[PDB]
Design a protein around this ligand. Structure first.
Ligand SMILES: *[C@@H]1O[C@H](CO)[C@@H](O[C@@H]2O[C@H](CO)[C@@H](O)[C@H](O)[C@H]2NC(C)=O)[C@H](O)[C@H]1NC(C)=O
Ligand SMILES: *[C@@H]1O[C@H](CO)[C@@H](O[C@@H]2O[C@H](CO)[C@@H](O)[C@H](O)[C@H]2NC(C)=O)[C@H](O)[C@H]1NC(C)=O
Ligand SMILES: *[C@@H]1O[C@H](CO)[C@@H](O[C@@H]2O[C@H](CO)[C@@H](O)[C@H](O)[C@H]2NC(C)=O)[C@H](O)[C@H]1NC(C)=O
Ligand SMILES: *[C@@H]1O[C@H](CO)[C@@H](O[C@@H]2O[C@H](CO)[C@@H](O)[C@H](O)[C@H]2NC(C)=O)[C@H](O)[C@H]1NC(C)=O
Ligand SMILES: *[C@@H]1O[C@H](CO)[C@@H](O[C@@H]2O[C@H](CO)[C@@H](O)[C@H](O)[C@H]2NC(C)=O)[C@H](O)[C@H]1NC(C)=O
Ligand SMILES: *[C@@H]1O[C@H](CO)[C@@H](O[C@@H]2O[C@H](CO)[C@@H](O)[C@H](O)[C@H]2NC(C)=O)[C@H](O)[C@H]1NC(C)=O
Ligand SMILES: *[C@@H]1O[C@H](CO)[C@@H](O[C@@H]2O[C@H](CO)[C@@H](O)[C@H](O)[C@H]2NC(C)=O)[C@H](O)[C@H]1NC(C)=O
Ligand SMILES: *[C@@H]1O[C@H](CO)[C@@H](O)[C@H](O)[C@H]1NC(C)=O
Ligand SMILES: *[C@@H]1O[C@H](CO)[C@@H](O)[C@H](O)[C@H]1NC(C)=O
Ligand SMILES: *[C@@H]1O[C@H](CO)[C@@H](O)[C@H](O)[C@H]1NC(C)=O
Lengths: 230, 79, 316, 37
């Protein structure tokens, strides 16, 4: 518990510096803000475009061609501005669909990671998932996935099953591993060898069928107690 | 626009004509994406190279060998 | 089968619309940012295609390599692993897929940028993932790769779906024979019908149709006296030919706007499919899924990815 | 597999559950304890 606490605290500390130092960490939100502001600006900037008319200022049209003919220039400007607004609205609709997809993904992530634990192997960051914490962001949500990454592996030589009086013993949970001379059973994700027992294993079939069996003795915890009381 | 017509640093790639960046026979990770699997990076010069998809790593394998971790490391990842 | 990308197209809006005519280019400039906005949108969807491939395939930090002494407990991955004999590193099923998809040439204004990752690199990435899921099971997708004998890995995968270990080892020969027969049958299954690769070929055909419709639009006139600008300038003096040129400008620009909107919609659709392919690559092959129909009809074991032109092909 | 008290766990009396059916359940400890004590 002490080591886990220290590692967790160090990681939760270092993430702050990771966000602080890197200038492009939050690019996925700044992209949205920049795109929206840029679309609005290029909409407004389009207001001063000509669209093939004697002028781009509205009132100048009303004082330089008289009503009988200035209606044509007004109509041309109207069509141009309306087309520009059409393009802006369509771009906004497509971007809103994209953001809706992103928000649905974020909602699924909240529900699965934050509110529970998800076995989806790469849905919540690298490594097996332990828990997560959400954090608010100006136009999005920031998660802190806390993941269990194993490390410092080492070689062992195994057999699929253990033969003992001709009965094929298998591991109940985990996998048989050998350090070279002895045999042990261990949980599949951590090296905590435990002496093989009839409670740690189970039996089925017999010797001849399995392909990679090896010879070893299986402990029986009832035998010492029975021999104590003869 | 006669600038950058020098012949000492004119290169040709499947992605197009590339001028100035010196071609190298080494390989590195992505820095700047040119097309067709060529990336350009800084070094006192600019170089353009073919992409390296990560250092080669071979897992020692046999019909009777396993590898189980003996320690863990917690980590936090943003998204 | 899942599509992940489409051809990165781009159009020179000014050059396309005005067709080298300098005076027409001067006139079109009065419209403002239309010709910049269209190019920007096309570039934006163009970059996303590289993003899709990098998201789907580059799930691994290293390029694993399968061992030379091939002793996978009787399982025979020959039909799935890369083939040294071919000039490319493509695997036999990958080669069949590459053959089964067939055709974007040089036009006026249009251009097709090459993908950021060539076919060789994508095949290399898929070989890396395949070697990782063969030798190391699922660990390599969530940490440092741990080797584990393949029959034992399959024995533990059985344990993940509620069937105890001893059902595998006592039936290893039968499991191997069934698996090899199915893998060998996949090749002729794909070769059986041209409709097998409907999605990828449909994507390519739709892209080509949109491009052709954009190019063919030039033959129209949109109410002008002719389709060629040089004829317009020959028939009328500038004060009268200006109206005809404006007519052609509005027509061609409307056509380009329609094409760009279609490309944006199709980009959203294909990016959704690429996100789905990325989720499947993350969940099925790198691990195992308890989602009872997300990874093929039945209880699930490890999958194998395969590269296809503009997509992936999973073997669930 | 033949039923034993090892792969079976106990809860409550025999009345509360519908569909209950009688049978014997082998014990992997009683014969040896009786044999050797
Ligand atoms: C492999 O594990 C065995 C477990 O029995 C080790 O043997 C024991 O080593 C300890 C070391 O202090 C001794 O106290 C025990 O008496 C040993 N067991 C027996 C039965 O004598 C062995 O050293 C380990 N070897 C390696 C290479 O890990
Ligand atoms: C793993 O492969 C090795 C080498 O191919 C096998 O080793 C042979 O095993 C047989 C049967 O025990 C012996 O008669 C040979 O002398 C061994 N030869 C060598 C070079 O080691 C081994 O049996 C295989 N194990 C499994 C579980 O497949
Ligand atoms: C594992 O143990 C079994 C049983 O002790 C061995 O099988 C015996 O091998 C001897 C070899 O001289 C034969 O005489 C016996 O008839 C065999 N008995 C049975 C039941 O098969 C087996 O060889 C051992 N294997 C290893 C790898 O140690
Ligand atoms: C597992 O790894 C951790 C570090 O990630 C090890 O903790 C270190 O242990 C050494 C020796 O006791 C100390 O000097 C360090 O200060 C520890 N680091 C931290 C961050 O606390 C730990 O020892 C490893 N476990 C094993 C069994 O070796
Ligand atoms: C694994 O499957 C491959 C299938 O590609 C087998 O390769 C065939 O081998 C036979 C006999 O050597 C040849 O006649 C065929 O031409 C090969 N190719 C095909 C497509 O059938 C291979 O023999 C199998 N076994 C091993 C150990 O690789
Ligand atoms: C379980 O079904 C498989 C077929 O899916 C059986 O395997 C076949 O067995 C027959 C008779 O032994 C053979 O003629 C076939 O060649 C086998 N096919 C394959 C693909 O191996 C298997 O025998 C069945 N299991 C049991 C216990 O009956
Ligand atoms: C199963 O066992 C129970 C308990 O022994 C039986 O219930 C008894 O049945 C006898 C039949 O003569 C009655 O006299 C008793 O009153 C019942 N209860 C008890 C507590 O003994 C039951 O009959 C058996 N058979 C079935 C089909 O349930
Ligand atoms: C196991 O041993 C081999 C050969 O000595 C070595 O190459 C390999 O790195 C070892 N395994 C691990 C996980 O380091
Ligand atoms: C680089 O590789 C090419 C092709 O293999 C070779 O022709 C050339 O001599 C090498 N060295 C340099 C400096 O280009
Ligand atoms: C339901 O089960 C009970 C015993 O568990 C049996 O007596 C009864 O006949 C069954 N009902 C039907 C419709 O099969």
């Amino acid at each position: 518990q002490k080591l886990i606490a220290n590692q967790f605290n160090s990681a939760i500390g270092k993430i702050q510096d990771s966000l602080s130092s890197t200038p492009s960490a939050l690019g996925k939100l700044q992209d949205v803000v920049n795109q929206n502001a840029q679309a609005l600006n290029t909409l407004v900037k389009q207001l001063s475009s000509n669209f093939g008319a004697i002028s781009s200022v509205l009132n100048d049209i009303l004082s330089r061609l008289d009503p009988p003919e200035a209606e044509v220039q007004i109509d041309r400007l109207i069509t141009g501005r309306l087309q520009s607004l059409q393009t802006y609205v369509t771009q906004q609709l497509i971007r809103a669909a994209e953001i809706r997809a992103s928000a649905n993904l974020a909602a699924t992530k909240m529900s699965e990671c934050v509110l529970g634990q998800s076995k989806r192997v790469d849905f919540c960051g690298k490594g097996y998932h332990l828990m997560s914490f959400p954090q608010s962001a100006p136009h999005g949500v920031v998660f802190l996935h806390v993941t269990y990454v194993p490390a410092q592996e080492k070689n062992f030589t195994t057999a699929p099953a253990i033969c003992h009086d001709g009965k094929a013993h298998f591991p109940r949970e985990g996998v048989f591993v050998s350090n070279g001379t002895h045999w042990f059973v261990t949980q599949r994700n951590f090296y905590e060898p435990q002496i093989i027992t009839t409670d740690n294993t189970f039996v089925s079939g017999n010797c001849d069928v399995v392909i990679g069996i090896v010879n070893n003795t299986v402990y029986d915890p009832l035998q010492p107690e029975l021999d104590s009381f003869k | 626009w006669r600038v950058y017509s020098t012949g000492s640093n004119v290169f040709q790639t499947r992605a197009g004509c590339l001028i100035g960046a010196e071609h190298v026979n080494n390989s590195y990770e992505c820095d700047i994406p040119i097309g067709a699997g060529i990336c350009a990076s800084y070094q006192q010069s600019i170089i353009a190279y073919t992409m390296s998809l990560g250092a080669e790593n071979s897992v020692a394998y046999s019909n009777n060998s396993i590898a189980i971790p003996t320690n863990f490391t917690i980590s936090v990842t943003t998204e | 089968i899942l599509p992940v990308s489409m051809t990165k197209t781009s159009v020179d809006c000014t050059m396309y619309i005005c067709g080298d005519s300098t005076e027409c280019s001067n006139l079109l400039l009065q419209y403002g940012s239309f010709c910049t906005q269209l190019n920007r949108a096309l570039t934006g969807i163009a970059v996303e295609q590289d993003k899709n491939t990098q998201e789907v395939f580059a799930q691994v930090k290293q390029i694993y390599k399968t061992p030379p002494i091939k002793d996978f407990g009787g399982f025979n991955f020959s039909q799935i692993l890369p083939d040294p004999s071919k000039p490319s590193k493509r695997s036999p099923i990958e080669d069949l897929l590459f053959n089964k998809v067939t055709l974007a040439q040089k036009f006026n204004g249009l251009t097709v940028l090459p993908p950021l990752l060539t076919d060789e690199m994508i095949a290399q990435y898929t070989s890396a993932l395949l070697a990782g899921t063969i030798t190391s099971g699922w660990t390599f997708g969530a940490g440092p790769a741990l080797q584990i004998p393949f029959p034992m890995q399959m024995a533990y995968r059985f344990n993940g779906i509620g069937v105890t270990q001893n059902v595998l080892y006592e039936n290893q020969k039968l499991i191997a024979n069934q698996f090899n027969s199915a893998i060998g049958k996949i090749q002729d299954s794909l070769s059986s019908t041209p409709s097998a690769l409907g999605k990828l070929q449909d994507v390519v055909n739709q892209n080509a149709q949109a491009l052709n419709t954009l190019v063919k639009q030039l033959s129209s006139n949109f109410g002008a006296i002719s389709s060629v600008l040089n004829d317009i300038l020959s028939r009328l003096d500038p004060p009268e030919a200006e109206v005809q040129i404006d007519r052609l400008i509005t027509g061609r620009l409307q056509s380009l706007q329609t094409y760009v909107t279609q490309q944006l919609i199709r980009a959203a659709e294909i990016r959704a499919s690429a996100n789905l392919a990325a989720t499947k690559m993350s969940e099925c092959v790198l691990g195992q899924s308890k989602r009872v129909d997300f990874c093929g009809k039945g209880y699930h074991l490890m999958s194998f990815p395969q590269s296809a032109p503009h997509g992936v092909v999973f073997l669930h």
